[PDB]
Amino acid sequence: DPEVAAAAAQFLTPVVHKMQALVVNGKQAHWNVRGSNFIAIHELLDSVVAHAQDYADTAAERIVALGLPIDSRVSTMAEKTSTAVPAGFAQWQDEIKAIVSDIDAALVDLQAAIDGLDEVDLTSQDVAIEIKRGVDKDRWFLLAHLAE
């Protein structure tokens, strides 16, 4: 099935882009974060970035194992992707809100992959589900700090 492979690339490719973007912009947030929660938030952002890289890898290799290429060069990723992470120094609350905003957009792509792969490829569906479990948990670890 050329269509099973076509459908994974269509649904999983946005996932590789946003997860690979989260690695880079996540490291930006980790470097520049300031303020009274520094060390916890600096470490937490490092763990989200490690997760993001593992997820980009799982999704990318699921596409490639099906026999289709992935274009995830820097130029392409920057084209398909954007970020609320500030350019410079920012308070820990602001870094959190910026990363949650990047995570929310990745969640919309994970859910679209989950619904889109239901009637086509349960194995590729399972990859988006496993990623969404981890990203939902990261989103909570981050956002619970602002709950009040």
Add this chain to the structure above:
Amino acid sequence: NITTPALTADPEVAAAAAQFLTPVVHKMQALVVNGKQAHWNVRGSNFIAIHELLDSVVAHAQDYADTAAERIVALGLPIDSRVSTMAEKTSTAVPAGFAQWQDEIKAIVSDIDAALVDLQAAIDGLDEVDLTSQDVAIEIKRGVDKDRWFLLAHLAE
């Protein structure tokens, strides 16, 4: 609130770190992304060894990007390596899709050679100004020099 003591403060020294280490952060972080690209898309008779070597190049580039970034931040200056900025400052020969292992190694040596030029500029440019930052540039150059050899040794014949 600016790192390094003895004299005050010094805005000069921080400003040189940012100037020479910033292109390093951007090229090393680009090499993480483009190296993963090469890692996913590589094909042909040397697949598993080159697939694995590229992962280890990426893991090094990521460490180097962090050490350079944190050295800039420790001196009290921000760093801009958002995806958008990094894309503007950086370019790759890694192909868009599948490619034979020889071609991937050439594309990645080309991107490493661009980083080397910026490391050698940092080493020269920091020599008169901040030996501690210079050491960061030196340490990353040794690792990058070795990764380059591991890549290039495959093409000797």
Add this chain to the structure above:
Amino acid sequence: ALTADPEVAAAAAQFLTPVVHKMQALVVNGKQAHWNVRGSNFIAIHELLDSVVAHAQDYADTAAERIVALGLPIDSRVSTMAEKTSTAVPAGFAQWQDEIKAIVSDIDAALVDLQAAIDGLDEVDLTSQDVAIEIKRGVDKDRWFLLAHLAE
């Protein structure tokens, strides 16, 4: 055991039993390929085969223990496994390209049984279906690692 509706257990045994057989066969024919492989890619491929064999052993265990957990026996004695299974791995020394092609061929027939399990367990037992999806994920990846070597 139990009033634990007997048709769920029977569907796992029917769809996962071929996975146990072909995965356990892959352990043995993979060791064969690992011992007897030759040529310019020897070390990497000898290593990669050992890793496919380790995966195949784990997948066989996982599928078999799912059947037995649901209360049914499994026959994968050597004699049953040999009746139910066949291999393209050569008898003796062979070049790495040839070993890879033979292993990918065995992997391709296991993938057939994995997808039949996935499709067949969908309206019956989602827990057992997840065992097959998990194995299929790993097998698809092992197949790409092997097959990428022949890509030109």
Add this chain to the structure above:
Amino acid sequence: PALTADPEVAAAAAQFLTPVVHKMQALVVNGKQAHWNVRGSNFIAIHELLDSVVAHAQDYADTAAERIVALGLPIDSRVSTMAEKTSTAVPAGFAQWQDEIKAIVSDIDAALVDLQAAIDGLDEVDLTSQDVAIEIKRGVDKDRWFLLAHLAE
């Protein structure tokens, strides 16, 4: 930054995974009771197997509960609540290893009924929470076999 992102999915998780948390967390406490009080010819093997069923159950409780909380709804698993929502066949004092296994298997059978119900209820609603129920069911099914296999003769 909303915190609960889909109230509907959140509610479905709370509805179907809350009994899973209660029974797994109760299984930690009553599994320990069986581990402490077990006697007879199979002591050391069963004492150790019960410890591993307890460690699983603690992880399953944690995974289930954090799935509900991540989605934005709280969980009440205080001791008083857990005790009102749960019961156990584990004996109050010393018991032979066969009776401990029967009692622990009866507790796991009631959790499998709640896991299957979660699997069924999450199917049209949230496949990501369904996957959490499916992962737990696989491990609990395995533990049930390990225990029950001792009684097969």
Add this chain to the structure above:
Amino acid sequence: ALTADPEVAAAAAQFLTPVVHKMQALVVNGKQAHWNVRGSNFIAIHELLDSVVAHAQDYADTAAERIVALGLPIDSRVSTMAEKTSTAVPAGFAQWQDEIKAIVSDIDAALVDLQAAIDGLDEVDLTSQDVAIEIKRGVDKDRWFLLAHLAE
């Protein structure tokens, strides 16, 4: 089983049984606080609460096995634990300060039972008394790690 100064066994049961119920309740109620905690200190307190629960589970096991090893049973079923124990941990989401104050409250009540075990075992069984001491040193330290956060 087989000895057995019923006396020393009785003292252990009298004094360590409340320690088992309170430590085992702290595992359950500490997990409740770990799940539901919110606020600017979330990650550190979520993690510290896990570490308290891990300690409390080891202390319950040590105190319970000390009683059983001496030859008396322990009734630590959920229904009995719920009858013997009470918690201030809230039913839902709560700010990290409130979770700390609730958990320090539950720890303060265990400390009263730990001190009564240490005094009560003193003339009776120094080996059971050492169990109560070892537990109290860890609980005292956990109480400080929690309470230090509120010192201002």
Add this chain to the structure above:
Amino acid sequence: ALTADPEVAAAAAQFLTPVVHKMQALVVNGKQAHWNVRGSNFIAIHELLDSVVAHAQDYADTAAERIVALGLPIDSRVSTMAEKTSTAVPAGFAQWQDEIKAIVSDIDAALVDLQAAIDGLDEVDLTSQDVAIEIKRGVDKDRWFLLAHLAE
């Protein structure tokens, strides 16, 4: 180019080849017993069989690699292994005592090939002899751990 006794290697391959078939069959038939074992000693015997299987796989690997190191191929495909090998392990569920007797029976047959290799290799290749001696030391030990269970 350059030396060696192809005679030595051929004689040695013929002594070790039976070892490889029986060891590799014991992996498959041991897993079979591991999955299907039942009764009052389940968890201990299930675990011990897993360790018997891991040793057998190491032994098959050590013997096969010895043969290949000497320059000779080895045919351990499933089809060949089934022709040369048989098992007393039952087709389905079996009481632990019977699983131990069946596995000991398979071990006993392997020990006949091992002893023949140790005796015959004494005059052929002391290096290959040492492989058989090491495999036999472990197998003699697994047999006692299994069998000591029926001593009463």
Add this chain to the structure above:
Amino acid sequence: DPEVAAAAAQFLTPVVHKMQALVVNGKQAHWNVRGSNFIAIHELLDSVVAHAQDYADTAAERIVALGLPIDSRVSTMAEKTSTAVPAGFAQWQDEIKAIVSDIDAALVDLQAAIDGLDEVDLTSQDVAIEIKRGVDKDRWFLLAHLAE
């Protein structure tokens, strides 16, 4: 003050001999045990032996650190010690009863040490108490098997 060191030697020396003897006699039971429970009991006896060796060390090193020699040559140890462990093959139930009987006699010496050291050296009494905790738990793990 010689009196502290003399009390330690006096009370801890029997503990060294009996723990050291339990290493040897427990190895004897570990090698020769037979029966339905072989593997569990074979492994449990190894674990008793490892504890016994650790305890004999800790007690001996306490005596020596206080300045006094210890004589636990084989010959001394055997004049001072006896065993119920059978000379050959024995069912697992009989090995357990013989090892528990050797443990019971070590318990009598441990309790005498705890009582004897109470008014004299609390630091050496802590050694006896820590060993008794461990031995009481080993005793239960053995005997629980015959509870029936």
Add this chain to the structure above:
Amino acid sequence: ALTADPEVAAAAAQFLTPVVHKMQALVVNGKQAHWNVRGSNFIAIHELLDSVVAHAQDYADTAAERIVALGLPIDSRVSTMAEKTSTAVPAGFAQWQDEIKAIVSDIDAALVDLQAAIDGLDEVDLTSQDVAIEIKRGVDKDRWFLLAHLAE
């Protein structure tokens, strides 16, 4: 002598000796801050200080042993260390913000000495200079980890 160059050795003692004292005093005063710290960031700051202390101990060792390797003694007795150093760390309980400022002040004093060492050793002994540069990289990072909390 025990030399080498008398001059080179002397330069290293001269420039690295202050570095040994300030690092070794930071162990001691960092532990102080670690024990006595309070307030809403307690756990994270309590852990952070322990890691600064573990680094300062390592830096003290590295610098001292560089001096001794070159054949010169080092006097880092408590009494000497106390004459040659001073601390802003409070005597008792303090809020985490104040411990951070006290520690960063002790660190800025040490950075002054590290920089004079890097400047003074440039012409004389580049091996010892590298010791000071390695330490200064670590200490600069430790300073940032602390001071970042007050940027607020």
Add this chain to the structure above:
Amino acid sequence: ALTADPEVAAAAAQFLTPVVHKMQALVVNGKQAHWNVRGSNFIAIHELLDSVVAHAQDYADTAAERIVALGLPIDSRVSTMAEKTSTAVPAGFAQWQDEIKAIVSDIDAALVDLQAAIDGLDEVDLTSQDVAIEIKRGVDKDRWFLLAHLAE
């Protein structure tokens, strides 16, 4: 602190504070002996002193934390530790016999403070006494490991 006994906190501070000063001083002076030791046993004694310093550091921590857990602060600033403590460890290079003698001397003065804590906490707080017993067991053993070298 707590809702109860001021005498418990005060006795712990009274008896364990000297122990913190002496153990923390032994970290500093032990490192001095470690760096400056010479002669035929260099490497064995260099290593042993590092292990003595690691223990002293852990003991200093355990005793300080016990005090703070009970609600009282501790002043182990360098300045204070210097006022309350002395050393026989020499200023520069010394033979290993004289480093062992100096370290033993510092350890004997610690043991006097530990035995005074043991005796003084006996009627006040058995949990705090247990801390002092545990440190004394370890320090007594370090003392023997060192002094046994001079039994020559």
Add this chain to the structure above:
Amino acid sequence: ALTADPEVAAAAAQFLTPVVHKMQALVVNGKQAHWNVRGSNFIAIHELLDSVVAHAQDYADTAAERIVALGLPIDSRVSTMAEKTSTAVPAGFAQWQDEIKAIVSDIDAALVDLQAAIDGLDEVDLTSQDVAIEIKRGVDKDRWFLLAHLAE
């Protein structure tokens, strides 16, 4: 037994029994020397004696389990071991030179039984011979590490 042979098992017991006794005795006598050793090489000899003890315990276990795997009991009760064995290790404190000489003397007596086993098993059971050779190889190395200290 197997379908195999009783005069093999009898040989093993005959040649390996005195090994089990002497190695197990070296455990106890080795501990005795490790406790009581004094003088300028204390820590290095203390630690060396512990490693010899650890090897001796493993060697006893390997010899004993070989005998038992063959189907024969082993009597290594304290009383039997004490009967079959003697030591030159002193009752009390002794200089490290004397402890080395006493231990090497116990080792030489074991080497005599190890050599008789190697010669005696040569025509009877090459598998048990291999156990004797493996033990002798370790014992020969331990002896060298001890004796090298007295060479001058």
Add this chain to the structure above:
Amino acid sequence: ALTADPEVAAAAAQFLTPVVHKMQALVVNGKQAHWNVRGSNFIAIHELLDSVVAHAQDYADTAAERIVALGLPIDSRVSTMAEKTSTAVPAGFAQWQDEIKAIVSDIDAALVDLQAAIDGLDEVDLTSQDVAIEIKRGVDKDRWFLLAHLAE
């Protein structure tokens, strides 16, 4: 040091000394090959050579320590090794097929010495013979991993 029989020690030196010289040279020449290897298989062969080197270093050590344990010296100074040993490893960069051919030639020469040691120790000292047997197993296996690459 010492030993029993001067003849045993003398045969060990005579037959194992050449093994020590060849293994030790293969560490040095193996490293040369590992530094200078080029071509399509660089990383696999670079890593494979490093593991051949690590094995050779261990075999050198084992053989040399066996000689010394029996009481005789070994002269393995660089000048001696160089007089006793030669290599076909090239001086400079070389393709991986050519590094493999050179290393395999150096191993072939060591295998001649090993087989001479095994034959020559057979009537003299089964313990030292077992050392040459174990080395020869490992080296025959390294030889295969190298040469398999050239089968095509």
Add this chain to the structure above:
Amino acid sequence: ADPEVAAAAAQFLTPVVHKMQALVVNGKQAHWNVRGSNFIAIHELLDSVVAHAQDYADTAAERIVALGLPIDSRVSTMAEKTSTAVPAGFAQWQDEIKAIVSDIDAALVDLQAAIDGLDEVDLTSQDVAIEIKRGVDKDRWFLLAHLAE
């Protein structure tokens, strides 16, 4: 792309590869043949000097190759370029130490020339020589402190 930089670096680091790789071999020699009252400690410390020396050899040789130049470190070249004071047979630990310290002293001469001469050529290769020199100076001290007596 300056070939003279790499060649100059190779020329400074090559004697370091030879002397370090010889110390591996002659250190093993001392580690096997050492006797006397401090046997176990010195036998062990010599094994750690050897493990360091092998690392230093590797790091220096691989910097040369990374620069694109071959290194000739065959046994025959190493023996032509190197000498040792380690005795041929059994020797007391004090004599093994003096011989090894003498080999180290000759290596420090080469490390110091590399450090001085790489200062104007290649700071990255200089840094390799400084790192090896820091480790070797520590091993020198660990050995020699036993004779300070």
